[PDB]
């Protein structure tokens, strides 16, 4: 599966690297980001899965 896609962004990233990857997710603004991607899922507040991927996703203690 070449290119690598931020649900959270809901953009497409062009190079799947170990590097770009990281490098998209370098900014403390993209935890913010994330709130407008489950923003209206449903009419609600849902800040509970968003820590549990975030922290728990590959290297985060
Ligand atoms: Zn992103």
Same mark, same amino acid.
């Given at each position: @599966?070449?290119?690598?896609?931020?649900?959270?962004? #809901? =953009?497409?990233? &062009?190079? #799947? $690297?170990? $590097? !770009? +990857?990281? &490098?998209?997710? $370098?900014? +403390?603004?993209?935890?913010?980001? !994330?709130? #407008?991607?489950?923003?209206?899922? @449903?009419?609600?507040? *849902?800040? $509970?899965?968003? #820590?549990? &991927? =975030? *922290? *728990?996703?590959?290297?985060?203690?």
């Amino acid at each position: @599966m070449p290119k690598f896609y931020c649900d959270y962004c #809901d =953009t497409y990233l &062009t190079h #799947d $690297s170990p $590097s !770009v +990857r990281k &490098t998209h997710c $370098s900014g +403390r603004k993209h935890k913010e980001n !994330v709130k #407008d991607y489950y923003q209206k899922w @449903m009419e609600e507040q *849902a800040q $509970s899965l968003i #820590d549990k &991927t =975030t *922290a *728990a996703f590959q290297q985060g203690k």
